[PDB]
Amino acid sequence: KFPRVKNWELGSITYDTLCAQSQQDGPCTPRRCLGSLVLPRKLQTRPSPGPPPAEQLLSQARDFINQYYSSIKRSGSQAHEERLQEVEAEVASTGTYHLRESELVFGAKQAWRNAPRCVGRIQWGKLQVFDARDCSSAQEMFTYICNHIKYATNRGNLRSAITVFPQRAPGRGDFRIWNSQLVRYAGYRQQDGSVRGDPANVEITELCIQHGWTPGNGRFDVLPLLLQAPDEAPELFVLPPELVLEVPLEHPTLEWFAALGLRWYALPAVSNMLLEIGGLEFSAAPFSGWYMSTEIGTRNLCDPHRYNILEDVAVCMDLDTRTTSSLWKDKAAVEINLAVLHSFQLAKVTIVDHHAATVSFMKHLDNEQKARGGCPADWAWIVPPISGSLTPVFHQEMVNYILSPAFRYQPDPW
Amino acid sequence: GPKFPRVKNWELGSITYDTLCAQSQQDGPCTPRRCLGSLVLPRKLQTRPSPGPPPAEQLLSQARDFINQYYSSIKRSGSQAHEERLQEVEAEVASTGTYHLRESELVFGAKQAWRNAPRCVGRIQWGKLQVFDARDCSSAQEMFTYICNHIKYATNRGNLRSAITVFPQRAPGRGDFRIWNSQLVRYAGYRQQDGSVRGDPANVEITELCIQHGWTPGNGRFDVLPLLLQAPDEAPELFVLPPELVLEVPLEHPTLEWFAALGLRWYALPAVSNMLLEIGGLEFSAAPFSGWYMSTEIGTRNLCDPHRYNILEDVAVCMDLDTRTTSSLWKDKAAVEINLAVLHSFQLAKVTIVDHHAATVSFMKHLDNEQKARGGCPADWAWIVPPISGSLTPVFHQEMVNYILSPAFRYQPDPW
Ligand code: HEM
Ligand code: HEM
Ligand SMILES: NC(=[NH2+])NCCC[C@H](N)C(=O)O
Numbered sequence: 070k071f072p073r074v075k076n077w078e079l080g081s082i083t084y085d086t087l088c089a090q091s092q093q094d095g096p097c098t099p100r101r102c103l104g105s106l107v108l109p110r111k112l113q114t115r116p117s118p119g120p121p122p123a124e125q126l127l128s129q130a131r132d133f134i135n136q137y138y139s140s141i142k143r144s145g146s147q148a149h150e151e152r153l154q155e156v157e158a159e160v161a162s163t164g165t166y167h168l169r170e171s172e173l174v175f176g177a178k179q180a181w182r183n184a185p186r187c188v189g190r191i192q193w194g195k196l197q198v199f200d201a202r203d204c205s206s207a208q209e210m211f212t213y214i215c216n217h218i219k220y221a222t223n224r225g226n227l228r229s230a231i232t233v234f235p236q237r238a239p240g241r242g243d244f245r246i247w248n249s250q251l252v253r254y255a256g257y258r259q260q261d262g263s264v265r266g267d268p269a270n271v272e273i274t275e276l277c278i279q280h281g282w283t284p285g286n287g288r289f290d291v292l293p294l295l296l297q298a299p300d301e302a303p304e305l306f307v308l309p310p311e312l313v314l315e316v317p318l319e320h321p322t323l324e325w326f327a328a329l330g331l332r333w334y335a336l337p338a339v340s341n342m343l344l345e346i347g348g349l350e351f352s353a354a355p356f357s358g359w360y361m362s363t364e365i366g367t368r369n370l371c372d373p374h375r376y377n378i379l380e381d382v383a384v385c386m387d388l389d390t391r392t393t394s395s396l397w398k399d400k401a402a403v404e405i406n407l408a409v410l411h412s413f414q415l416a417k418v419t420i421v422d423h424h425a426a427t428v429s430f431m432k433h434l435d436n437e438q439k440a441r442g443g444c445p446a447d448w449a450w451i452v453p454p455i456s457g458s459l460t461p462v463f464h465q466e467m468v469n470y471i472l473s474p475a476f477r478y479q480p481d482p483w
Numbered sequence: 484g485p486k487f488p489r490v491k492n493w494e495l496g497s498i499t500y501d502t503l504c505a506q507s508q509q510d511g512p513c514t515p516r517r518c519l520g521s522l523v524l525p526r527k528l529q530t531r532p533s534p535g536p537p538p539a540e541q542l543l544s545q546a547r548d549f550i551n552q553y554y555s556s557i558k559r560s561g562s563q564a565h566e567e568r569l570q571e572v573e574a575e576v577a578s579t580g581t582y583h584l585r586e587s588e589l590v591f592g593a594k595q596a597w598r599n600a601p602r603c604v605g606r607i608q609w610g611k612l613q614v615f616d617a618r619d620c621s622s623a624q625e626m627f628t629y630i631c632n633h634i635k636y637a638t639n640r641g642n643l644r645s646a647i648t649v650f651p652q653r654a655p656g657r658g659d660f661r662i663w664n665s666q667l668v669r670y671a672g673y674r675q676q677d678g679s680v681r682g683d684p685a686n687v688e689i690t691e692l693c694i695q696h697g698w699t700p701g702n703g704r705f706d707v708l709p710l711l712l713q714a715p716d717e718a719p720e721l722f723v724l725p726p727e728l729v730l731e732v733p734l735e736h737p738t739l740e741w742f743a744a745l746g747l748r749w750y751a752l753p754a755v756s757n758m759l760l761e762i763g764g765l766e767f768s769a770a771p772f773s774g775w776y777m778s779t780e781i782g783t784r785n786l787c788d789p790h791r792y793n794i795l796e797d798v799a800v801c802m803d804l805d806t807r808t809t810s811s812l813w814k815d816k817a818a819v820e821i822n823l824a825v826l827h828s829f830q831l832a833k834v835t836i837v838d839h840h841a842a843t844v845s846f847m848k849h850l851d852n853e854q855k856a857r858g859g860c861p862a863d864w865a866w867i868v869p870p871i872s873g874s875l876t877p878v879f880h881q882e883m884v885n886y887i888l889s890p891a892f893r894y895q896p897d898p899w
């Protein structure tokens with residue numbers, strides 16, 4: 070029934086009882102485990118042209134409202150009872166309902182708290198929630214997004230935030246941010262199939278050009294936003310350069326590193342995920358925190374299908390790239406990550422290294438064990454892409470399951 | 484599309500479907516409700532000592548399954564030899580409750596077990612395993628002889644050869660043949676007065692057991708442990724491996740001249756000895772196997788895990804790194820040098836070893852071979868991706884499907 074979770078570094082054991090509260094199924098079965106898969110095969114988020122079964126929505130709604138009143142220690146109170154009645158009344162008559170701002174704020178924080186792949190959840194309680202449901206056009210979306218960025222960036226002293234646009238509605242198109250992140254570097258396919266810039270952003274870069282954007286020709290050209298109001302073609306918006314904080318990359322002791330002309334933006338803001346609260350779905354709810362150095366130094370800069378700078382750095386370090394056994398890749402990666410940390414610290418921009426991050430996550434696991442009897446966590450995503458076993462989370466067994474409120478993937482709007 | 488798991492490789496953007504998982508007849512620990520894939524020891528395979536004879540009906544089906552696998556492998560499925568072998572197995576079980584494997588069947592089953600091991604990154608070599616049949620072994624002393632021969636053949640003066648030695652299978656009511664040590668070669672772990680451990684903390688229990696059994700302990704950081712070998716229904720007997728048989732490699736760094744002064748070392752032969760080999764229902768409680776090391780096993784896990792030798796800080800201090808702050812990446816820097824030292828020293832001593840880059844590239848080739856040969860390959864992502872430089876290797880970007888296929892190697896309870 071309840072899984073026994075062990076930490077092999079400390080010898081300690083715990084029992085996850087929270088997983089029982091899971092109402093949504095993952096991709097695994099007793100026959101085979103598909104935990105290493107990035108996206109769901111079916112756990113997607115099918116269209117919403119028709120209203121969801123009132124019974125199902127109503128049960129998810131009640132559960133959420135129940136969750137909310139427990140949080141404010143007012144369960145069973147008169148307000149709790151009236152709120153449930155309001156929800157019942159609205160669903161029965163319209164097939165849907167609406168959240169109160171306070172509930173939305175509670176729901177957003179819970180979704181982050183329940184995100185199995187986020188290593189920064191110890192900060193889950195300090196989330197600035199912007200209510201953007203009052204939005205009715207792509208232009209208005211652009212204004213909200215610009216305010217989110219200004220606030221979140223805060224001159225380098227990053228602050229976690231989320232902006233919530235209008236929920237999905239039956240038979241009506243969704244509000245969507247076509248970009249996967251609010252700030253991304255263009256990826257231009259060139260003559261021989263190669264790519265200048267970020268290979269991960271080729272498709273979105275092309276859509277922007279298709280929709281009237283005048284493309285640059287650099288390796289780090291910040292893309293424009295393609296914002297979509299319900300049932301309307303997406304509109305193009307260029308972000309004001311002064312709002313997009315960037316950090317030039319240099320190395321503490323390797324003078325030549327800066328000559329590589331590398332840089333990265335300060336604000337990591339996922340904008341293509343769906344936020345689900347009490348059965349309601351928010352198709353556009355960009356959120357941001359701050360980077361963990363391995364995301365830039367290891368994945369973005371060193372992944373083979375990304376900037377893939379490992380070899381260049383290796384050669385500048387005059388390493389023996391003749392054989393794998395010289396561990397030249399491992400050596401270059403460490404320096405690149407060091408350069409990232411050094412640079413962000415120099416530019417006074419918030420950033421956390423993987424050691425500090427994983428240590429904070431272990432604390433979070435403990436806090437959650439006492440507060441809720443468990444913590445859904447995805448081991449493959451929590452453990453850093455380098456020096457895995459050198460961090461504490463590597464030696465910690467984890468249970469992964471889906472709790473709601475939750476952040477989920479959704480189909481690309483095109 | 485296809486009604487099987489869709490597996491993607493994000494580096495190459497290629498896709499494959501695993502149809503082999505359809506052949507799994509043993510449930511894992513996961514459910515649609517929650518994933519328990521990270522658990523090291525999930526109460527699943529766990530071959531708990533099953534005294535009373537196994538349900539003849541369950542054993543038979545497992546036996547028939549294996550014989551079918553065997554005859555399919557030699558392309559004679561449906562043949563007269565196949566149906567007669569099936570009749571012979573069912574008959575033997577009918578009158579005795581169990582059955583026995585032909586030599587070639589044992590060889591086939593042992594290789595399939597390795598091939599089927601989800602956590603092994605060295606499976607591209609699966610077909611070249613040397614299977615030593617020791618099913619005639621009748622004493623703990625004889626177990627020692629067999630083990631010494633295995634160690635000698637496998638070590639082969641540094642040019643290691645994969646091998647497995649299979650002792651008699653489990654029998655009803657009769658005690659099991661067991662090797663108490665977790666590996667044929669392990670360093671002692673001595674509990675200290677202040678509560679610390681000198682040597683390898685992972686072997687404190689086995690070390691204490693060896694002592695309780697007459698072993699006169701040493702006081703070093705790398706004392707090779709003796710073997711506690713147990714024949715059916717007898718207390719375990721203690722055997723000391725002749726030093727000349729245990730090849731070790733002193734560790735030195737290619738450029739950091741002081742590293743050699745650290746006095747670190749490791750043995751060349753990795754030989755797991757506490758796992759159970761299950762073939763067609765039959766259980767081989769004692770069947771030690773060995774290959775060769777992947778450098779991160781020694782350099783990162785054994786030497787740097789907090790609960791093992793934990794030498795990260797010592798080396799960082801020697802490298803004069805800032806160990807007072809995480810952002811200096813002192814742990815990362817020291818780990819890399821320790822791993823390089825391991826590769827350098829083994830190469831120097833001409834002892835077989837494979838670095839994590841070479842190993843993972845070879846495992847990718849293995850996955851492709853297996854996709855064509857069986858429609859998939861059971862792999863445990865968390866165990867396949869190396870403990871350092873994870874995303875710098877190709878396997879990190881390869882999604883994997885984990886499941887249990889038989890023949891298989893399984894964990895079994897400690898005999899004490
Ligand atoms: C405050 C600093 C934060 C840090 C250091 C952090 C770090 C991380 C990391 C390392 C990942 C995995 C990234 C990857 O491998 O692509 C992740 C994933 C995630 N984070 Fe956070 N996070 C932070 C804030 C937030 C906030 C504010 C939210 C939401 C309100 C959030 C929601 C998520 C979600 C839902 C995922 C999974 C995204 C996916 O599946 O691609 N995180 N986070
Ligand atoms: C030829 C060289 C070989 C290499 C490089 C190799 C490498 C590895 C590695 C790195 C692991 C995980 C180690 C750990 O984290 O503890 C492993 C696990 C395993 N290997 Fe291999 N292996 C080799 C040969 C063999 C052989 C010959 C067999 C069996 C006939 C085998 C069976 C297994 C099994 C069953 C496991 C999992 C044991 C456990 O769960 O602790 N390997 N191997
Ligand atoms: N620390 C974060 N909030 N990360 C969000 C995901 C960022 C993504 N991994 C990137 O490299 O851009």
Ligand SMILES: NC(=[NH2+])NCCC[C@H](N)C(=O)O
Nearest residue numbers: 753774775776777780781785
């Ligand atoms: N390469 C191998 N055959 N490894 C088997 C496991 C050895 C174990 N990881 C050790 O470091 O002792």
Ligand SMILES: [Zn+2]
Nearest residue numbers: 097102513518
């Ligand atoms: Zn699973």
